[PDB]
Amino acid sequence: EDLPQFLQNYLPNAGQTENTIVPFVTLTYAQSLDARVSRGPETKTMTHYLRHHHDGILVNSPRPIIIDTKQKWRFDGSKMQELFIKRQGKPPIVVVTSEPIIKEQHVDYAICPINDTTKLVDWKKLFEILKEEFNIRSVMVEGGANVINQLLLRSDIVNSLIITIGSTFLGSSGTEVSPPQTVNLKDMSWWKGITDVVLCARLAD
Amino acid sequence: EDLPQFLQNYLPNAGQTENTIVPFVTLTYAQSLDARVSRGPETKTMTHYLRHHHDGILVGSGTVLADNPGLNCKWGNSPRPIIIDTKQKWRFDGSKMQELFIKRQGKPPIVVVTSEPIIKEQHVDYAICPINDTTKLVDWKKLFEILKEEFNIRSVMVEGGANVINQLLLRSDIVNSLIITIGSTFLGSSGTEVSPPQTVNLKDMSWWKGITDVVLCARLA
């Protein structure tokens, strides 16, 4: 709508990550008034517009990037697998902590060593691996509220934050997005729709 | 500024002509992106403009006990403060509210209790509201009726208590307008959140946008 002009300054910017080893990282999600992303229109256009401006998407057409540290996901027999077959959808990059004994066709494996301290995955190292090993110049992370909750803390990684808020309450039992500490924003910009609003911003510090 | 017309349809006297037994009730609060109201300049003025249009301003005790709020109005007379204090632990004597009352800058409070007031304070009015036999908590419908019938409160703005908000969000038979400000900040998951226990659908929504904040006006579906 007027949405492309609104998003423009927050889209991956070529000359900004070029001659760096990190990709542009956008953090994006859709929540209710009570900050829930699940429970216990018009956003299609925007999401698909955003996706086609990124090389990878962490959950032309973007490549799917899946975290599967515990190694239990499978490509064969996935929506993704079928989409790949019909010439409209790329095969996934699968993020793991060690080399899997059994690998699937078309699937790329990114071995990211779990962080020494946090005991979680080293987000900085993972994003460099995606960029350097797999030509992923930009990445749109869409969810796992737990992924979002960690990355909200990473002002040194995240480049743009794009949040849709719908005019509804999902209820307290729904899965929330809220960082463990306070997170300040900068360079904020709001767009308003009929029933929804979108925030574009950056992470302070 | 466009804020007055934006709010116009959601204020008590856009409510047209009919006399009612229930006061007009606006549910209004300010939250972070993570729906938090407590820690873990345009909106402040709006709040005051809103206060100017209501006979009463309601808060749960706890929010009065935490922040020591004036709860009076400045131009965007003043509304009467209404404190829910079922435990009868809030004290008017020595409060900021009392300071404003003495300086003729604010009104004395109405205190809502659920049994005989034990220590009545000078210039304080007490509203004894029945307890709902199902919830064990105060009967919101009867309370608002009493505020109107006994204390001549024709309209009330409830601002405070996540706990209060969380209950009223479920009461489409009580709430006339929902007005929510959302700031562009995260307070963090330790902060106290506003989220009702069940899904709540909204209707008649209209959004307003500032530079750092957005405001939603809606009604309960």
Numbering used by the authors:
A (entry chain B): 8 to 47, 57 to 75, 98 to 243
B (entry chain A): 8 to 47, 57 to 92, 98 to 242
From the paper:
In archaea and fungi, DAROPP is reduced at the phosphoribosyl moiety by RIB7 yielding 2, 5-diamino-6-ribitylamino-4(3H)-pyrimidinone 5′-phosphate (DARIPP), which is then deaminated into 5-amino-6-ribitylamino-2,4 (1H,3H)-pyrimidinedione 5′-phosphate (ARIPP) by RIB2. ScRIB7 exists as a stable homodimer, and each subunit consists of nine central β-sheets flanked by five helices, resembling the structure of RIB7 homologues.
The structure of ScRIB7 was solved using single-wavelength anomalous dispersion (SAD). The crystals belong to space group P212121, with one asymmetric unit containing two ScRIB7 molecules. The RMSD between the C-alpha atoms of the two subunits is 0.3 Å. Each monomer is a mixed α/β structure: nine central β-strands flanked by five helices which are similar to those of the reductase domain of known RBSRs. The size of the calculated interaction area was 1,303 Å2. There are nineteen hydrogen bonds, and seven salt bridges between the protein atoms across the interface and the extensive hydrophobic surface formed by residues Tyr36, Leu40, Ala42, Leu190, Leu199, Ile201, Ile203, Phe207, Leu208, Val215, Val221, Leu223, Met226, Trp228, Trp229, Ile232, Val235, and Leu237. ScRIB7 has a unique α1 compared to MjRIB7, while EcRibD and BsRibG have N-terminal deaminase domain.
